Design a protein around this ligand. Sequence first.
Ligand SMILES: Nc1nc2c(ncn2[C@@H]2O[C@H](COP(=O)(O)OP(=O)(O)O)[C@@H](O)[C@H]2O)c(=O)[nH]1
Ligand SMILES: Nc1nc2c(ncn2[C@@H]2O[C@H](COP(=O)(O)OP(=O)(O)O)[C@@H](O)[C@H]2O)c(=O)[nH]1
Ligand SMILES: Nc1nc2c(ncn2[C@@H]2O[C@H](CO)[C@@H](O)[C@H]2O)c(=O)[nH]1
Lengths: 246, 248
Amino acid sequence: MAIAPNTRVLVAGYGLPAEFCVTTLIGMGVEIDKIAVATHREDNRNSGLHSMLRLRNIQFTTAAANSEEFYEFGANFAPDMIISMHYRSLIPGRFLKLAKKGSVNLHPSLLPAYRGTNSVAWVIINGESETGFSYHRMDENFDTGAILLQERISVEETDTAFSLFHRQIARAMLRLEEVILKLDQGDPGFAQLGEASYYARELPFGGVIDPRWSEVQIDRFIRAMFFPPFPPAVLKIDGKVYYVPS
Amino acid sequence: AIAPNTRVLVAGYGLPAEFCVTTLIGMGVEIDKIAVATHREDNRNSGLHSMLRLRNIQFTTAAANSEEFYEFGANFAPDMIISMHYRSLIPGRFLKLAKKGSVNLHPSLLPAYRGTNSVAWVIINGESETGFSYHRMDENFDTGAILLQERISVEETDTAFSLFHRQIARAMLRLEEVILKLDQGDPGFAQLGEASYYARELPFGGVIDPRWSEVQIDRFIRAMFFPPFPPAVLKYYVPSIDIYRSLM
Ligand SMILES: Nc1nc2c(ncn2[C@@H]2O[C@H](COP(=O)(O)OP(=O)(O)O)[C@@H](O)[C@H]2O)c(=O)[nH]1
Ligand SMILES: Nc1nc2c(ncn2[C@@H]2O[C@H](COP(=O)(O)OP(=O)(O)O)[C@@H](O)[C@H]2O)c(=O)[nH]1
Ligand SMILES: Nc1nc2c(ncn2[C@@H]2O[C@H](CO)[C@@H](O)[C@H]2O)c(=O)[nH]1
């Protein structure tokens, strides 16, 4: 029902999912001096977070995940639990070991499907009618730890990377409190089950339409590349670049 | 699914508005079918401003009563207006623009706790429950028809701070549903019960009366707790009931 009083929570996070997470923790009655945040520099997605951390005087670091300052920041805070909410770096194992209740990260697929990055794009490229999000404990690798909560999200024929990425955030937030409680209560989760799949760091197909693709493949790709303000899918014709309308 | 080519103007401020925009995008509302009316970029509103700049969403920060504001709405031609912690009265003629009307998020169970400082006043008054009301706007503050209400338990450990933040959190999770009610033309249910209204004014100027019972003092301390603002004062600074007892 309620979080253990004096639970100390460290949020490794970036942007709106993180602002929402700190909001939620405060709503759960976690004291202000029992919240610590690790994040990245203030850019045009992290401005909401930063302003909140300054406004509420929430201790935070922007130091790199592999830096000694980051480890110190965690060590001095002594978290019971760590919540990764769109943090953008590999979190060292020795940092995760600081939280005796362990940790959780939000990943935008049904793990072990769509390990890697750009999951939302690839889901659409492969023509998935269904995807999901996975709140999972973190181990030393990305995308591999035990599942605390997974929920299905249906993929529509009109979805873009853009629409799906934002619905992922919105829907995942619904379950965040239950997840924070699962962590409070020591829920071990379950080992990720099923066949994995993996998709490389960089932008799918370099953003470039393959002319050999079927129309269905092209429609999917166009939508998967739609993500303002980034350029749309590129079609090359007579060795020359053209942005698609979408 | 929200009707295609539905045009949505969000009047709002801070995370609730950023989260609204996020939600509309996730629902399939395209950038050029979203417009934002907000206030200046400040320490609560730079999340929203950053998103507007990054995604090239048209917006205004012109005052609610200004011709500029009106013109931004008229020119966009909203099907619906969503007010997400917008801090000004929106003129009737602006609301008129939206054919499917409007909705506003108020953090009480209306008509109870109209006005401002709802979360603080709920705690002082010893309420055990409060909640939020998503309600159609008319030309007055806090009076229009109810689309959706949800109850929030007020715990003995709750501060204005915790309760302010839980309000936002829990309201955000009902928002998609509310957007669908507006879309589908749900007229809502007019407001019934005793109205209450509370002002801008800091209750008792933040100073603890030692004639109050411990139960009252505790509530007041909790209701005054909102970082980074100063806590309750005793005749000095008193953030917890523990600290009160010590001073006594
Ligand atoms: N068209 C385009 N889309 C992008 C680009 N970078 C990111 N995206 C989209 O934005 C989504 C989120 O990107 P990011 O926040 O970097 O997530 P991560 O790389 O998956 O951890 C990705 O799934 C892509 O769909 C880009 O350079 N071009
Ligand atoms: N202690 C203290 N709390 C404040 C002060 N101003 C605002 N707050 C708290 O912040 C909450 C939200 O303030 P605001 O965003 O202005 O909402 P409003 O109720 O619509 O005016 C209020 O309900 C108060 O609990 C202040 O000067 N001192
Ligand atoms: N979730 C996830 N993130 C990754 C993976 N590989 C690289 N990244 C992150 O993506 C970034 C590349 O822009 C790197 O800094 C990593 O932090 C992966 O397999 N899974």
